[PDB]
Amino acid sequence: VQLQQSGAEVMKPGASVKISCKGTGYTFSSYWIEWVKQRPGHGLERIGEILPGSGSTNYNEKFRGKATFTADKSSKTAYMQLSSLTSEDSAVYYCARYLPYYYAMDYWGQGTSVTVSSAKTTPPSVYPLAPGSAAQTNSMVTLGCLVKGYFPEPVTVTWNSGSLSSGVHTFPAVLQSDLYTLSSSVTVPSSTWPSETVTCNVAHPASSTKVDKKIVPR
Amino acid sequence: DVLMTQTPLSLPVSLGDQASISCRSSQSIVHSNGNTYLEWYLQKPGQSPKLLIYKVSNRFSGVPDRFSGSGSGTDFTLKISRVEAEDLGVYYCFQGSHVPWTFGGGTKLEIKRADAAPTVSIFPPSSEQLTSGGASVVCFLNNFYPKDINVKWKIDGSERQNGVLNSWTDQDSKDSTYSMSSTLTLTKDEYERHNSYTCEATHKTSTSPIVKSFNRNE
Numbered sequence: 495v496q497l498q499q500s501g502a503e504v505m506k507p508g509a510s511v512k513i514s515c516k517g518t519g520y521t522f523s524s525y526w527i528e529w530v531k532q533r534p535g536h537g538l539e540r541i542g543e544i545l546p547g548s549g550s551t552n553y554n555e556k557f558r559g560k561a562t563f564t565a566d567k568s569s570k571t572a573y574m575q576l577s578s579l580t581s582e583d584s585a586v587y588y589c590a591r592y593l594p595y596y597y598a599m600d601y602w603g604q605g606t607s608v609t610v611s612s613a614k615t616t617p618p619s620v621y622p623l624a625p626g627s628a629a630q631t632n633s634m635v636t637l638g639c640l641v642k643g644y645f646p647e648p649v650t651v652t653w654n655s656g657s658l659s660s661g662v663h664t665f666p667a668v669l670q671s672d673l674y675t676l677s678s679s680v681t682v683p684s685s686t687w688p689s690e691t692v693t694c695n696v697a698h699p700a701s702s703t704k705v706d707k708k709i710v711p712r
Numbered sequence: 713d714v715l716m717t718q719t720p721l722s723l724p725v726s727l728g729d730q731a732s733i734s735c736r737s738s739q740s741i742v743h744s745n746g747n748t749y750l751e752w753y754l755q756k757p758g759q760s761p762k763l764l765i766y767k768v769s770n771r772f773s774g775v776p777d778r779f780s781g782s783g784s785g786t787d788f789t790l791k792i793s794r795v796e797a798e799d800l801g802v803y804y805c806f807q808g809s810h811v812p813w814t815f816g817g818g819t820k821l822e823i824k825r826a827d828a829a830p831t832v833s834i835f836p837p838s839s840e841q842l843t844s845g846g847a848s849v850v851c852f853l854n855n856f857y858p859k860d861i862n863v864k865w866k867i868d869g870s871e872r873q874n875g876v877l878n879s880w881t882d883q884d885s886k887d888s889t890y891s892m893s894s895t896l897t898l899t900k901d902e903y904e905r906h907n908s909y910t911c912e913a914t915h916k917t918s919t920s921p922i923v924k925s926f927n928r929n930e
């Protein structure tokens with residue numbers, strides 16, 4: 495048994511998207527397909543369900559009109575269409591297999607990520623950050639490599655060939671205005687910092703960008 | 713639409729300590745066949761939810777016996793006897809009794825330990841930031857527990873609050889300590905105009921805010 499979902503999607507506000515969930519290894523037509531929304535913040539919200547065998551569908555009142563379900567019996571796939579996309583529709587959507595009053599949602603899809611925004615594929619703008627001139631030097635000093643002005647997610651910030659696997663704190667990306675920005679901090683002894691060389695290996699698969707820039711001491 | 717409410721929103725419990733999540737229904741979710749259809753799901757970070765319990769008490773095939781459910785009417789509870797690091801995540805309710813079927817709010821389970829003091833730091837904008845025409849003042853508050861943290865920026869004695877960037881990192885594993893990377897962005901004309909930039913840190917471990925500032929004039 496396996497439920498396979500479509501890939502990540504990026505759409506502009508006011509558009510519509512069509513996600514799909516393909517089920518194999520069981521009687522596809524005889525199990526309901528539950529659609530669950532998970533905003534990045536928190537919470538699981540059920541959009542509705544469809545029984546592919548018949549055409550029966552149910553919708554939660556919050557999503558009635560926003561989402562429409564359809565199923566294809568020939569190819570064991572179920573579709574959900576979201577209309578008039580907005581910012582609040584950006585979330586990760588799951589599909590699950592359910593039989594009411596019997597076997598519960600034991601199998602889920604991998605999750606399809608949908609982002610609604612008018613931005614384009616902007617590359618990263620990494621700004622390596624060094625300690626300020628007016629700052630005391632201690633035994634343990636934390637470095638800083640800022641990345642901002644990039645879209646869409648994700649950007650894999652790391653060190654040179656995993657130079658410092660431990661002591662790394664990659665803070666989550668956030669939308670400052672319309673683009674995503676993140677940060678990182680790695681603890682390194684002041685003794686080895688002048689000698690040992692490490693650089694934040696910022697990456698951006700969506701823009702096919704791979705730029706790394708280290709911080710110079712003050 | 714039956715509303716399911718979970719309390720507490722968060723439940724810090726140390727390893728080996730019994731945990732107890734609770735669930736409430738806007739209306740009774742009993743069914744005629746002699747069963748009430750309540751299910752418990754666990755969603756670890758970056759993964760789809762996994763089924764744990766169904767029909768209040770029945771355990772899904774392959775879950776440790778430490779999990780157990782019980783309840784009736786509009787009151788149900790999930791108990792974890794001996795918690796373990798693999799049990800971290802968000803636990804969700806699900807009523808499968810009345811159409812449409814609704815999820816619970818969720819209860820983020822965390823592990824508690826001895827409080828750790830914050831490690832505050834401030835880094836001024838880098839050269840490339842000046843060249844690009846901006847300002848990236850970043851404050852790093854690493855390894856602080858619990859979540860009782862607040863950030864306030866008082867520029868040259870004036871408290872700025874518009875355009876504040878708030879970013880928090882989830883609980884770690886090696887140390888299980890939170891972190892914060894709230895920052896602020898300023899324009900060159902708005903950056904050179906002022907003189908003193910400060911970043912306080914208010915935490916339970918130290919009631920007095922921690923001061924970490926630099927002056928533009930150097």
Ligand SMILES: *[C@@H]1O[C@H](CO)[C@@H](O[C@@H]2O[C@H](CO)[C@@H](O[C@@H]3O[C@H](CO)[C@@H](O)[C@H](O)[C@@H]3O)[C@H](O)[C@H]2NC(C)=O)[C@H](O)[C@H]1NC(C)=O
Nearest residue numbers: 593594595596597743744745746747748749767769770809
């Ligand atoms: C539709 O009607 C059938 C026939 O009465 C119902 O089947 C019965 O369901 C109950 C509840 O699960 C079964 O009792 C339970 O059986 C399990 C497995 O043996 C056991 O572990 C439990 O402790 C409990 O005894 C009962 O055996 C079963 N009877 C038959 C003949 O299958 C069914 O629940 C009804 N469905 C609905 C939606 O009303």
